[PDB]
Amino acid sequence: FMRREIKIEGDLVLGGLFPINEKGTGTEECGRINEDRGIQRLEAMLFAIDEINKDNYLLPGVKLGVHILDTCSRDTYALEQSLEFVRASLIPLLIAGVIGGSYSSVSIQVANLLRLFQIPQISYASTSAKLSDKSRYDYFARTVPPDFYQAKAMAEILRFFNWTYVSTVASEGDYGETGIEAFEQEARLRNICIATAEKVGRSNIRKSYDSVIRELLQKPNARVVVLFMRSDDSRELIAAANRVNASFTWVASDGWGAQESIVKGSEHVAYGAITLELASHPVRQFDRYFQSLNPYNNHRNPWFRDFWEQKFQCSLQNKRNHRQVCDKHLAIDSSNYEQESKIMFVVNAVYAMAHALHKMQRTLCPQTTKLCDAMKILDGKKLYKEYLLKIQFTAPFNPNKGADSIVKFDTFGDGMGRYNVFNLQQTGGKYSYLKVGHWAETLSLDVDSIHWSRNSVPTSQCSDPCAPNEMKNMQPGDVCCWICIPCEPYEYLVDEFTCMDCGPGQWPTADLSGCYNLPE
Amino acid sequence: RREIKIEGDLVLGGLFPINEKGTGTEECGRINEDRGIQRLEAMLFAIDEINKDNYLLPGVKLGVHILDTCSRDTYALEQSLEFVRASLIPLLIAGVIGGSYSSVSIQVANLLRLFQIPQISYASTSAKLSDKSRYDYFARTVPPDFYQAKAMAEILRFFNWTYVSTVASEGDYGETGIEAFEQEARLRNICIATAEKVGRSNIRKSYDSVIRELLQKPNARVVVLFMRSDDSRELIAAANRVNASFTWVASDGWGAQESIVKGSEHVAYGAITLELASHPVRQFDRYFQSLNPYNNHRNPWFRDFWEQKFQCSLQNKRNHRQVCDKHLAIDSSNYEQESKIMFVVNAVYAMAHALHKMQRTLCPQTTKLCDAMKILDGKKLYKEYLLKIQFTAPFNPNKGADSIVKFDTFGDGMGRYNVFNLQQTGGKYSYLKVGHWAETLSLDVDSIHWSRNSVPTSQCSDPCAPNEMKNMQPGDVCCWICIPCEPYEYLVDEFTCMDCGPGQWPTADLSGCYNLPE
Numbered sequence A: 001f002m003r004r005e006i007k008i009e010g011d012l013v014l015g016g017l018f019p020i021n022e023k024g025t026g027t028e029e030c031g032r033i034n035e036d037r038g039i040q041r042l043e044a045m046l047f048a049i050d051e052i053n054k055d056n057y058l059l060p061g062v063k064l065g066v067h068i069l070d071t072c073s074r075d076t077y078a079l080e081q082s083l084e085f086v087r088a089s090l091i092p093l094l095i096a097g098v099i100g101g102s103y104s105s106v107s108i109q110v111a112n113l114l115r116l117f118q119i120p121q122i123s124y125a126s127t128s129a130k131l132s133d134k135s136r137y138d139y140f141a142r143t144v145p146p147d148f149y150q151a152k153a154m155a156e157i158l159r160f161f162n163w164t165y166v167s168t169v170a171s172e173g174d175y176g177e178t179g180i181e182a183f184e185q186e187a188r189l190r191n192i193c194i195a196t197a198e199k200v201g202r203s204n205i206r207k208s209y210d211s212v213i214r215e216l217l218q219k220p221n222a223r224v225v226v227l228f229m230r231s232d233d234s235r236e237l238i239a240a241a242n243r244v245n246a247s248f249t250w251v252a253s254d255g256w257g258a259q260e261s262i263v264k265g266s267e268h269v270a271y272g273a274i275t276l277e278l279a280s281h282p283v284r285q286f287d288r289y290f291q292s293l294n295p296y297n298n299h300r301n302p303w304f305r306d307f308w309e310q311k312f313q314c315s316l317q318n319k320r321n322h323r324q325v326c327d328k329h330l331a332i333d334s335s336n337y338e339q340e341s342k343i344m345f346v347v348n349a350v351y352a353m354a355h356a357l358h359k360m361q362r363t364l365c366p367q368t369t370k371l372c373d374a375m376k377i378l379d380g381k382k383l384y385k386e387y388l389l390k391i392q393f394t395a396p397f398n399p400n401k402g403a404d405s406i407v408k409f410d411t412f413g414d415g416m417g418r419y420n421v422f423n424l425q426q427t428g429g430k431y432s433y434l435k436v437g438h439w440a441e442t443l444s445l446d447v448d449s450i451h452w453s454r455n456s457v458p459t460s461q462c463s464d465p466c467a468p469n470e471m472k473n474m475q476p477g478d479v480c481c482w483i484c485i486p487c488e489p490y491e492y493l494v495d496e497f498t499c500m501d502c503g504p505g506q507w508p509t510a511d512l513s514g515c516y517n518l519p520e
Numbered sequence B: 001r002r003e004i005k006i007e008g009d010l011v012l013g014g015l016f017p018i019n020e021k022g023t024g025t026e027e028c029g030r031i032n033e034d035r036g037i038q039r040l041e042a043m044l045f046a047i048d049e050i051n052k053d054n055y056l057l058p059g060v061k062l063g064v065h066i067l068d069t070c071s072r073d074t075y076a077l078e079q080s081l082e083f084v085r086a087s088l089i090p091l092l093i094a095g096v097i098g099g100s101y102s103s104v105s106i107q108v109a110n111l112l113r114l115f116q117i118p119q120i121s122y123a124s125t126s127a128k129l130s131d132k133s134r135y136d137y138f139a140r141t142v143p144p145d146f147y148q149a150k151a152m153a154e155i156l157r158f159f160n161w162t163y164v165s166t167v168a169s170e171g172d173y174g175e176t177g178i179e180a181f182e183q184e185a186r187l188r189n190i191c192i193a194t195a196e197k198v199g200r201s202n203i204r205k206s207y208d209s210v211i212r213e214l215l216q217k218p219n220a221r222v223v224v225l226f227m228r229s230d231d232s233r234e235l236i237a238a239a240n241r242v243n244a245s246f247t248w249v250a251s252d253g254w255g256a257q258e259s260i261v262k263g264s265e266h267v268a269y270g271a272i273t274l275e276l277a278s279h280p281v282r283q284f285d286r287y288f289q290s291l292n293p294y295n296n297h298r299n300p301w302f303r304d305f306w307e308q309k310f311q312c313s314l315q316n317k318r319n320h321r322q323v324c325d326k327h328l329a330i331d332s333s334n335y336e337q338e339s340k341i342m343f344v345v346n347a348v349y350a351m352a353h354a355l356h357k358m359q360r361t362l363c364p365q366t367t368k369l370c371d372a373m374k375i376l377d378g379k380k381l382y383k384e385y386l387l388k389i390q391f392t393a394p395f396n397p398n399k400g401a402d403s404i405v406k407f408d409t410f411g412d413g414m415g416r417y418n419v420f421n422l423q424q425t426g427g428k429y430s431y432l433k434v435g436h437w438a439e440t441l442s443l444d445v446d447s448i449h450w451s452r453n454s455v456p457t458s459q460c461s462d463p464c465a466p467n468e469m470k471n472m473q474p475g476d477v478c479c480w481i482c483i484p485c486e487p488y489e490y491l492v493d494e495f496t497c498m499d500c501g502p503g504q505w506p507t508a509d510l511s512g513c514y515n516l517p518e
């Protein structure tokens, strides 16, 4: 009955798309509130717009408005909502550009729509490599890198700990499938075989995941399971593993990332997991802004109440038929809130669009700081090719300027491929993610601080290890599996895969490391 | 804001270039009578028939939502938004019938695929639409220009027109169409004197400029055209002004439309044009001729259509004069079924047969839209429609002349074309079928009337004199020079002179040598 949205007027308006809500189960289209990747990212855009609207050096004289919508984590829904943006270019606010798409699936479908009306789009999280194709997504840019690189980082971590026999599970779609495809290619090149390639799809229930766990279990040697799945799907897989109390060493992509919500209620099953996330640094000024928000001072965000009641398990006078009203002294603070991993990218995205519009206004309107007649009807094509050439220092909210804190784009409209490696620990009774490394162009990580599953650096190879006393390692046709050939009592192991006759007068040591002389 | 909205259990969207492209600031212009109104009424006709057919979708009435494309892809695209807001007053669209211009079909296809809405064009021929990785919800009852280009190239290669000029419309129809021609040209040793091309929002000057440039290649007397219907009209008009005259070889953009040559007949005389191979739908002639402003209120464009066809006025027109005879009528003396009507009717029936099969399959217990089909799976529909094979809507005699409608793996139709020649014999100007192309060219040259009563010559250079010149090929394979030879030399062959040698002299015809006396 009531489809929510945020509409703030301005001289120029930016559309916004965020998975404020989780995917709806079954018949419903939207589900629970997505706290970190939803509300936080939403408020980060509102935050960025407010700052920009008070910045006398960026778009002074041109107030930015917004038209933010919920994608409910589904491309089809995001697609229907976006229609709102194009009808505008005919109550309806004119869209200069769109900030958004978290899930690659929504960004892509949305990009397919927006290009038809020349509306530039900047995603702050979609990493699918497909999006680098300017022949299909010619009005799309992003402040993040293509998974072409994330897949390498993952394959190089496996190749590091010599995990040559692993299983993979990918989400159906442009995120999971193309990402896992990239990984597989990187795997082959580094002599890593895949035990079993599983994949979950759209509208899947418990049984589809349990069925995945079972198939992973049917590959006992493959103890390391590479994941490239959507956030929600990831949550389902771990919940499925927790049921049959299955346990593997997980290597997940940013879909999982460093979210605690993913492991909540299954912490022991995910313990020791290794996950990747785009290299970022929190935006300090945003912490202040987000923490100051409350149901009393934040009426412009029509999803904040639901947010509030879910984060604190509340109720006021604006909820279902429940119980337990809430403490008017509640507050978002350092004890219950941690800046979402990609906030930095949301702010840089919004700022990139602003800088692009700003340079265009400086150019087409040389007499004032106002939106002159020449820019009354924006040439979206030019805007996008004024936007691609943009280069500026990350919104002031970034210390220094030496750690290459410049926002710009590839010729494909992509950002720089930099990732951080995380390890799910629990040392202090509580479960949390610890940065245990990073990937820029080459892998890097201090193995000593990594807490593994079952306190031992996992082993993930195709065949069982050979018995000492007499077996030799034998490689058949591949470079992952082998057979163990016990040797003759008169042979010793010159090396792991070779048996040699000790020769006359000599006999192998109990150890088989050498030969000793025979008496008598 | 005109449109046709008829409710039904299932609704089919439709798109037609009802109006011509608007000039300058205006978005729509004059009425497109044959390619617009007729095609529109043909869909209305097909829907009515289907709605009276007890064996096709009995129990499931088909409605429509037909919109004008005003012959512009951007306009058609904006209109089409109407079809997708629906799947959220707004009628839910099961599938869309339409796009005449390839450019509108393409843009509409980029939108419709996003909402899994199948689309069948009855006229868009661009080869680009065969790409199922981009237009995966698109199909058509007509073939791709990959073939029309071959037909045109083979025609030139037949009459040995090796030096021709080309002019193409900017867009996915003209450019890709002309590119294909060029490739087919090289392969048959045909050179292009000059490659001209007109674009969007072009005025007289842009065309006059094309005529001039064509005139700067006098030897190229044959000009191959791959242009939009409207652009074609502009080019012929421009040629008429400076009274320029060439032998035209145009694609279906021009086709067999008399409206293209009206008021420039002598300039297009002898032109050779192509059109998709088709046969009129007889039952449609009855339906269309029965239409008048009094009985046809469901077509909001009919009054304007009537006023323009008959140069009218009633009480629903601009501030003009000359009211209209209430006895006026569309009849055998002022109406001829548009060439592609058949494809429009088959496109609609293809969609109907696909829905019918889907309804029989998902609703085995009733002839009604059961709950299982409440929300259509458009992806399945499209791959339940691609496999469709049926005999052309009853409106087609026999069944042996392969009158079956079906699609390629690419969703295309069969590449069959007819070749026409613009004549005038009986005082009046008309298009005569002088041949056809199925897989190989075919035409009886004897019935073709040429421009200037003589089978045209279009070669790079003048033929060499017999008596003594040899053919000499420079750097290219189309142009050459003529070198007369020494009186004591003969032509061993067309391009080589050779000394007859001592005691000998060349024969009067230079084919050989004869002995000298004395």
Ligand SMILES: *[C@@H]1O[C@H](CO)[C@@H](O)[C@H](O)[C@H]1NC(C)=O
Residues within 6 Å of the ligand: A160, A161, A162
């Ligand atoms: C991987 O294998 C190589 C070669 O035997 C070895 O040097 C390296 O230490 C292994 N990596 C680890 C840490 O397991």
Ligand SMILES: *[C@@H]1O[C@H](CO)[C@@H](O)[C@H](O)[C@H]1NC(C)=O
Residues within 6 Å of the ligand: B158, B159, B160
């Ligand atoms: C040239 O064209 C004429 C006309 O059809 C034909 O009779 C003749 O065989 C052709 N010769 C060539 C160049 O093949």
Ligand SMILES: N[C@@]1(C(=O)O)CC[C@H](C(=O)O)C1
Residues within 6 Å of the ligand: A037, A102, A103, A104, A105, A125, A126, A127, A128, A175, A230, A231, A254, A255, A256, A342
């Ligand atoms: N990189 C993501 C994608 O779907 O492309 C996976 C997780 C990212 C996120 O939303 O945080 C977006």
Ligand SMILES: N[C@@]1(C(=O)O)CC[C@H](C(=O)O)C1
Residues within 6 Å of the ligand: B035, B100, B101, B102, B103, B123, B124, B125, B126, B173, B228, B229, B252, B253, B254, B340
């Ligand atoms: N085959 C056309 C196209 O633009 O694709 C050129 C003329 C056809 C027509 O409208 O009759 C359609």
